[PDB]
Amino acid sequence: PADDALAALGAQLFVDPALSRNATQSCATCHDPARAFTDPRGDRNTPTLGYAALVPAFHRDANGKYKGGQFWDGRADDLKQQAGQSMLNPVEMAMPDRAAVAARLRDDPAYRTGFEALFGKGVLDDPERAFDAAAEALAAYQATGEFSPFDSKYDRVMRGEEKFTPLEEFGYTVFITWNCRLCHMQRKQGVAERETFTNFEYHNIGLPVNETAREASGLGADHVDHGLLARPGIEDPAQSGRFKVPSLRNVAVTGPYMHNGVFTDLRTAILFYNKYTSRRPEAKINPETGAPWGEPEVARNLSLAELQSGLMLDDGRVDALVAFLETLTDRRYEPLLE
Amino acid sequence: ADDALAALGAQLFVDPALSRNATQSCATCHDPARAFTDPREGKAHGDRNTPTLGYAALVPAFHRDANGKYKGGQFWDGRADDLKQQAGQSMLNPVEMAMPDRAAVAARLRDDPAYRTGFEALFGKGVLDDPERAFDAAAEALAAYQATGEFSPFDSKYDRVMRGEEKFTPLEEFGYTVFITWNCRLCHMQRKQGVAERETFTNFEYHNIGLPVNETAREASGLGADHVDHGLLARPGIEDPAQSGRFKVPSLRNVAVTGPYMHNGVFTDLRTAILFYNKYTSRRPEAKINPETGAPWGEPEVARNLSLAELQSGLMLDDGRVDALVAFLETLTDRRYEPLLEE
Amino acid sequence: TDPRAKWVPQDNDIQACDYWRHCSIDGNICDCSGGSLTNCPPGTKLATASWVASCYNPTDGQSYLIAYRDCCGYNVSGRCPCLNTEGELPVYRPEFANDIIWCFGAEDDAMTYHCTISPIVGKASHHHHHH
Amino acid sequence: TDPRAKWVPQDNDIQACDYWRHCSIDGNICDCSGGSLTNCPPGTKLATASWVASCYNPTDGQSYLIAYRDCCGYNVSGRCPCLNTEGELPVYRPEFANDIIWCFGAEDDAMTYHCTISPIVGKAS
Amino acid sequence: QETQGQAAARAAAADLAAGQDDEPRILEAPAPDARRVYVNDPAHFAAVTQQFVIDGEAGRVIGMIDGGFLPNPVVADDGSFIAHASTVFSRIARGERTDYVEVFDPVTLLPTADIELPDAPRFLVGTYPWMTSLTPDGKTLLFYQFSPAPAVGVVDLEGKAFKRMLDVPDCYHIFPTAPDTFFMHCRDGSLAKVAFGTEGTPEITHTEVFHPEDEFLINHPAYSQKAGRLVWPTYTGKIHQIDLSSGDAKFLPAVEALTEAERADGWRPGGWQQVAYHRALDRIYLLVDQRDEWRHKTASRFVVVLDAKTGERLAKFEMGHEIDSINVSQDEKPLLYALSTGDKTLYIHDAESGEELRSVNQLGHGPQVITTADMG
Amino acid sequence: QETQGQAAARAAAADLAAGQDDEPRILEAPAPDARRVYVNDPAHFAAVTQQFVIDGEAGRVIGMIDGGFLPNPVVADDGSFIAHASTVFSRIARGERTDYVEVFDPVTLLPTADIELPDAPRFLVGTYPWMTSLTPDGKTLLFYQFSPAPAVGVVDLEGKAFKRMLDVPDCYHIFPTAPDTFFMHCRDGSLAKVAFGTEGTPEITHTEVFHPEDEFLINHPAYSQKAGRLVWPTYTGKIHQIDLSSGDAKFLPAVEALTEAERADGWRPGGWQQVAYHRALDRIYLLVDQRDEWRHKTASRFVVVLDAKTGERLAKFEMGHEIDSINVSQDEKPLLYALSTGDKTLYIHDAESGEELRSVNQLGHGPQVITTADMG
Ligand code: HEC
Ligand code: HEC
Ligand code: HEC
Ligand code: HEC
Ligand SMILES: [Ca+2]
Ligand SMILES: [Ca+2]
Ligand code: NA
Ligand code: NA
Ligand code: NA
Ligand code: NA
Identify each DSSP E strand in E168-228 by its residue range.
Answer: 171-178, 181-186, 191-195, 203-206, 222-224
Residue E37 Cα, gap to closest chain C Cα (Å): 14
| D100 contact residues in E (CB cutoff 8 A) | 123-126, 146
Cis peptide before B260 (omega within 30 of 0): yes
- CA–CA separation, E347 and E341 (whole Å): 11
Q: Is F164 on the interface with A (CB under 8 A)?
A: no
Q: Find, among A204, E26, F125, E53, the residue nearest to C106 by Cα.
A: E26
Does A184 show up as a binding residue in the annotation?
yes
Cβ neighbour number for residue A167 with a 10 Å cutoff: 15
Residue F66 Cα, gap to closest chain E Cα (Å): 7
List, as ranges, residues 10-49 from D with C-beta within 8 Å of B: 38, 48-49
Contact predicate A74/A58, CB 8 Å:
yes
Residue B280 makes CB contacts below 8 A (sequence gap 6+) with B308, B311, B312, B313
> b/e per residue, F284-312, with b = 16+ CB within 10 A?
bbbbbbbbbebbbbbbbbbbbbbebeeee
Identify each DSSP E strand in F135-266 by its residue range.
Answer: 140-145, 151-156, 161-167, 171-178, 181-186, 191-195, 203-206, 222-224, 229-233, 238-243, 250-251, 255-256
Residue type, E35: R
Tell whether A279 and A157 lie within a shared domain.
Answer: yes
Helix ranges (H only) for E115-155 are none
Contact predicate D31/D101, CB 8 Å:
no
Residue type, B319: D
CA A70, chain centre distance (Å): 8
Contact predicate D68/D116, CB 8 Å:
yes
CB pairs under 8 A between A and C: 60
Tell whether B186 and B276 lie within a shared domain.
Answer: yes
Tell whether B72 and B205 lie within a shared domain.
Answer: no
Say which of E124, E172, E297 has its CB closest to residue D111: E124
- CA–CA separation, E261 and E259 (whole Å): 5
Give the Å distance between the CA of B249 and the centre of ligand 4. Answer: 7
Residue A141 makes CB contacts below 8 A (sequence gap 6+) with A7, A8, A9, A10, A11, A13, A14, A147
Q: Is C47 on the interface with E (CB under 8 A)?
A: no
- Helices (H) and strands (E) counted in chain D, each on its own, are 0, 7
- Helices (H) and strands (E) counted in chain B, each on its own, are 12, 6
Query: What does DSSP assign to residue F189?
Result: S
Helix ranges (H only) for chain E are 4-18, 260-264
Query: What does DSSP assign to residue F43?
Result: G
- CA–CA separation, A93 and A85 (whole Å): 9
- CA–CA separation, F335 and F351 (whole Å): 5
Query: What does DSSP assign to residue C100?
Result: B
Task: Give me the number of domains chain F comprises.
Answer: 1
Cβ neighbour number for residue E138 with a 10 Å cutoff: 18
**Ligand found nearest the CA of B233:** 10
- CA–CA separation, F368 and F219 (whole Å): 13
Chains touching E (at least 3 CB pairs under 8 A) are: A, B, C, D, F
Is position C70 annotated as part of the catalytic site?
A: yes
Handedness of CA F141, F142, F146, F151 (dihedral sign): positive
Give the Å distance between the CA of B50 and the centre of ligand 9. Answer: 14
Domain boundary among B153, B184, B208: B153
The CATH number of the domain holding residue C31 is: 2.60.30.10
Contact predicate F98/F88, CB 8 Å:
yes
First to last CA, chain B: 41
3-state secondary structure of B58: helix
Closest residue by Cα to atom 11, ligand 1, is: A46
Q: ∠E70-E76-E80 over CA atoms, to 5°?
A: 125
- CA–CA separation, E108 and E106 (whole Å): 6
- CA–CA separation, A14 and A34 (whole Å): 14
Residue type, B311: L
Contact predicate C10/C20, CB 8 Å:
yes
- CA–CA separation, F151 and D71 (whole Å): 41
Which helix (H) or strand (E) covers residue A130, if one does?
A: helix A127-142
Query: What does DSSP assign to residue A34?
Result: G
Q: How far is CA C106 from CA A205, A276, C73, C111, in A?
A: 19, 15, 8, 7
Q: How far is CA E286 from CA D84, E174, E258, in A?
A: 22, 21, 10
Q: Find, among F340, F351, F338, the residue nearest to F278 by Cα.
A: F351
- CA–CA separation, A99 and A104 (whole Å): 9
Between helices A109-119 and A2-14, what is the axis angle to 10°? 150
Domain boundary among A149, A177, A192: A149
Residue type, B325: L
Closest residue by Cα to atom 35, ligand 3, is: B87
Q: Find, among C123, C103, C114, the residue nearest to C31 by Cα.
A: C114
Q: Is F213 on the interface with A (CB under 8 A)?
A: yes
Burial zone of F33 (CB within 10 Å; 0-12 exposed, 13-18 middle, 19+ buried): middle
What values do phi and psi take at F259, rounded to 5? -75, 165
Contact predicate B35/B336, CB 8 Å:
no
For ligand 7, a single-atom ion, the residues with CB < 5 A are A 210, 212
Per-residue DSSP letters for E8-22?
HHHHHHHHHHHT---
Give the Å distance between the CA of B219 and the centre of ligand 9. Answer: 9
- CA–CA separation, E83 and E157 (whole Å): 10
3-state secondary structure of B285: helix
Task: Give me the number of domains chain C comprises.
Answer: 1
Domain boundary among A149, A181, A207: A149
List, in sequence order, every residue forming a beta bridge with E88; answer none if it has no partner: E98
In total, chain A counts a number of residues equal to 338
- Helices (H) and strands (E) counted in chain C, each on its own, are 0, 7
- CA–CA separation, C122 and F243 (whole Å): 44
Q: Virtual CA dihedral for B277, B280, B283, B287, nearest 10 degrees?
A: 40
Q: Is F78 on the interface with A (CB under 8 A)?
A: no
- E275-278 and E283-290 beta bridge pairing: antiparallel
Residue type, A304: L
Q: ∠B322-B328-B329 over CA atoms, to 5°?
A: 90
Tell whether B145 and B159 lie within a shared domain.
Answer: no
Between helices A127-142 and A98-106, what is the axis angle to 10°? 80
Residue A47 Cα, gap to closest chain E Cα (Å): 28
List, in sequence order, every residue forming a beta bridge with F336; answer none if it has no partner: F328, F349
CA B304, chain centre distance (Å): 23
Handedness of CA E30, E33, E36, E40 (dihedral sign): positive
Between helices A315-326 and A166-177, what is the axis angle to 10°? 100
- CA–CA separation, F260 and F279 (whole Å): 27
Q: Find, among F309, F373, F362, F369, the residue nearest to F339 by Cα.
A: F369
Contact predicate E352/E62, CB 8 Å:
no
Q: Find, among F338, F329, F335, F336, the residue nearest to F376 by Cα.
A: F329
Contact predicate E368/E40, CB 8 Å:
yes
Does A59 show up as a binding residue in the annotation?
no
- CA–CA separation, B128 and B113 (whole Å): 11
List, in sequence order, every residue forming a beta bridge with F337; answer none if it has no partner: F327, F348
Residue F146 makes CB contacts below 8 A (sequence gap 6+) with C94, C100, F123, F125
Chain A interface residues facing chain F, Cβ-Cβ under 8 Å? Answer: 166, 277-280, 310-312, 314, 316
Residue A221 makes CB contacts below 8 A (sequence gap 6+) with A214, A215
Q: Find, among D81, D72, D2, the residue nearest to D44 by Cα.
A: D72
- CA–CA separation, B325 and B84 (whole Å): 34
Tell whether A132 and A169 lie within a shared domain.
Answer: no
Contact predicate C74/F93, CB 8 Å:
yes
Contact predicate E44/E62, CB 8 Å:
no
In total, chain D counts a number of residues equal to 125
Between helices A109-119 and A98-106, what is the axis angle to 10°? 110
List, in sequence order, every residue forming a beta bridge with E203; answer none if it has no partner: E195
- What's the Rg (C-alpha) of chain A? 21
| E169 contact residues in B (CB cutoff 8 A) | 318
Helix ranges (H only) for F59-112 are none
Contact predicate E211/E189, CB 8 Å:
yes
Query: What does DSSP assign to residue E265?
Result: T
Per-residue DSSP letters for A244-269?
EPPP-TTGGGS-SBTTTT-B-SHHHH
Closest residue by Cα to atom 43, ligand 3, is: B96
Q: Find, among E80, E56, E85, E58, the residue nearest to E69 by Cα.
A: E85
Please tell me which residue in F69, F104, F162, F317 is annotated as part of the active site.
Answer: F69
Tell whether B132 and B213 lie within a shared domain.
Answer: no
Q: How far is CA E21 from CA A187, E17, E295, in A?
A: 7, 11, 56
3-state secondary structure of F45: helix
Tell whether A243 and A133 lie within a shared domain.
Answer: no
Q: Find, among E130, E99, E329, E113, the residue nearest to E244 by Cα.
A: E130
CA F85, chain centre distance (Å): 14
3-state secondary structure of B174: helix
Tell whether A157 and A103 lie within a shared domain.
Answer: no
- CA–CA separation, A241 and A224 (whole Å): 9
Chains touching A (at least 3 CB pairs under 8 A) are: C, E, F
Q: How far is CA A55 from CA A11, A131, A139, A197, A200, in A?
A: 20, 23, 12, 11, 7
- CA–CA separation, A186 and A204 (whole Å): 18
Give the Å distance between the CA of B200 and the centre of ligand 4. Answer: 13
- CA–CA separation, B325 and B315 (whole Å): 15
Task: Give me the number of domains chain B comprises.
Answer: 2
Contact predicate E143/E173, CB 8 Å:
no
- CA–CA separation, E34 and F4 (whole Å): 53
Between helices A79-88 and A127-142, what is the axis angle to 10°? 120
Max alpha carbon distance in chain B (Å)?
68
In total, chain B counts a number of residues equal to 343
Q: Find, among F287, F299, F285, the residue nearest to F343 by Cα.
A: F299
Cβ–Cβ of F63/D38 closer than 8 Å? no
- CA–CA separation, A301 and A201 (whole Å): 14
- CA–CA separation, C103 and C100 (whole Å): 9
Please tell me which residue in E45, E52, E69, E196 is annotated as part of the active site.
Answer: E69
CA F82, chain centre distance (Å): 12
Q: Find, among A121, A126, A133, A93, the residue nearest to A9 by Cα.
A: A133
Tell whether A316 and A196 lie within a shared domain.
Answer: yes
- CA–CA separation, B237 and E54 (whole Å): 72
Residue D117 makes CB contacts below 8 A (sequence gap 6+) with D30, D35, D36, D37, D38, D39, D40, D46, D68, D69, D70, D71, F24
- What's the Rg (C-alpha) of chain B? 21
Per-residue DSSP letters for E347-371?
EEEETTT--EEEEE----SS--EEE
Can you give the residue range of the structural domain that contains F126? 1-376
- CA–CA separation, B149 and B126 (whole Å): 31
Query: What does DSSP assign to residue A200?
Result: -
- CA–CA separation, B226 and B232 (whole Å): 18
- E36-41 and D120-123 beta bridge pairing: unpaired
Q: Is C17 on the interface with F (CB under 8 A)?
A: no
Give the Å distance between the CA of B31 and the centre of ligand 6. Answer: 12
3-state secondary structure of C29: strand
Can you give the residue range of the structural domain that contains A26? 1-149
The CATH number of the domain holding residue F67 is: 2.130.10.10
CA B131, chain centre distance (Å): 29
Closest residue by Cα to atom 32, ligand 4, is: B274
Closest residue by Cα to atom 38, ligand 2, is: A180
| C45 contact residues in E (CB cutoff 8 A) | 26
Ligand 4 atom closest to the CA of B317, numbered from 1: 38
CB pairs under 8 A between A and F: 21
Tell whether B56 and B196 lie within a shared domain.
Answer: no
Tell whether B72 and B164 lie within a shared domain.
Answer: no
Contact predicate C32/C77, CB 8 Å:
yes
Contact predicate B314/E148, CB 8 Å:
yes
The chain C residue lying nearest E365, using CA atoms, is: C78
In chain F, residues preceding a discontinuity (C to N beyond 2.5 A) are none
Residue A37 makes CB contacts below 8 A (sequence gap 6+) with A31, A48, A49, A50, A147
Contact predicate C96/C51, CB 8 Å:
yes
- CA–CA separation, E254 and E239 (whole Å): 6
Tell whether B145 and B171 lie within a shared domain.
Answer: no
